[PDB]
Design a protein around this ligand. Sequence first.
Ligand SMILES: NC(=O)c1cn([C@@H]2O[C@H](CO)[C@@H](O)[C@H]2O)c2ncnc(N)c12
Length: 553
Amino acid sequence: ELENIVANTVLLKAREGGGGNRKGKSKKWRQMLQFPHISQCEELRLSLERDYHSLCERQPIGRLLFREFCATRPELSRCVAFLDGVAEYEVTPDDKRKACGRQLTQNFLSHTGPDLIPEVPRQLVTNCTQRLEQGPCKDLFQELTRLTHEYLSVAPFADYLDSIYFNRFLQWKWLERQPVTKNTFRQYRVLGKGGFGEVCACQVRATGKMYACKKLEKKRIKKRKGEAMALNEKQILEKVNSRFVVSLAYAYETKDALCLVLTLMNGGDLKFHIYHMGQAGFPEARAVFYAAEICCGLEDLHRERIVYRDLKPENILLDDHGHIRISDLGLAVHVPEGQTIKGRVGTVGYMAPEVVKNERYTFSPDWWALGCLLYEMIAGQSPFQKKIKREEVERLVKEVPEEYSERFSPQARSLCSQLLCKDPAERLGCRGGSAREVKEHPLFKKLNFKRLGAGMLEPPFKPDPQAIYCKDVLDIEQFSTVKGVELEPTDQDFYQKFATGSVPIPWQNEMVETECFQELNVFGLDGSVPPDLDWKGQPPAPPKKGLLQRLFS
Ligand SMILES: NC(=O)c1cn([C@@H]2O[C@H](CO)[C@@H](O)[C@H]2O)c2ncnc(N)c12
């Protein structure tokens, strides 16, 4: 049991700060992130669609590079400042808002000073001054915002595309397109057993950022014919850019497995925190908070027409600051507009009635599971689970109503009840309010949801950073690595479909978070001090005074 203590101390060190000044970065990272030749970018230039929204808004490095570009020209720079102001303004609370709102009005709409855009209609200016002072609303400046973006997205965009800044962007992009492999990362101790493989911590060598690596063993996939499940979780996480769903940064392959590299949630899973963390369950305030986050998560997925179908403690995880994110989306699936889907899938205990009955549905099942979970967090026990068998529990779900203890408050009961209403058409969330009607339950008196979704609300429990919230290494399952299955050409075509490489938005973020972008992107400072002697070894006209003093006394 040296192995246990070893692996644990390693991981915690990586989580601490790698090896000194370089924050986990390999000593040869600059080499690893060496830009390519400009000629090496043309093929790529052509590939990239000229899309304002993609190149200047969605893609953080791309956005930075544009912003940086706009700094070179004051008429632009000031636009960017304006948009910045409004984005802040819109998230500034009621009492402080008008105070903040005037500063903008006075700065960017002074009728004596220079114009904001080349053609700003005067009538549109007077309206704001008026509309503001009486009732400062959230969509106050939408008129100007819209015009500003319409301005930038045409000429300044074109001018940028045709500037050095874009050449830089192309290079940055070239790097993200470079193939990802085993060798990109450092591996650490495993943190769990998935359906199809291990799930261990890991680190990007070049950048030192920590990720979780969900391994899916190539063989175990073919045996269980879970090709759909694997590609599905990928394609889904690839698309979802939610604050409450583990984001995917890389998809690659090895000899033995396909990997998904995912946000690393150091606070561990809610299953651990409910059971193996002192007395079972959480206080009300706490249980509620998570239910509210998990709710926002579901809102996020649903809004992208995705039903999750596997909410449960195992698959909710906690981050460094004690916030949560949904995970394991193998069972998730898209729900086309105006349609319904049937699929008897999930975990025994958390599948709602209509799923168990093998009926058609849209999003009902998730709101059920939120109920189950919100129950389980207060109660300290699954509402339908000592070992029991499958058929018994399903009966328990389909017919018997839930059984409460006295930990539940008055309103705490009603919510779980309404979520565990067995009639899906009458269930909370499914009546025709979506998340809104669940958010509006009085149990969430105290939480401003607008803020929670912006991650501005502090949770009631910050994890201990020095703690590792899961089992030790040898105290973990390991199913029979079954032989009797050869990998064949048909599988290679699929692996090609899966092993995409680095996910743009996350990847780009990684570089900015690890100061790799700033450190490497900038150009003109290093080795720029105009030199003491010209090429032929003679001083300039006139010579540098610091050399003369150094050459004599
Ligand atoms: N796929 C994932 O997102 C993760 C799975 N685990 C662990 O592996 C188990 C598999 O559900 C969980 O209970 C966690 O202990 C994780 N641990 C930390 N961060 C993550 N992103 C995951």
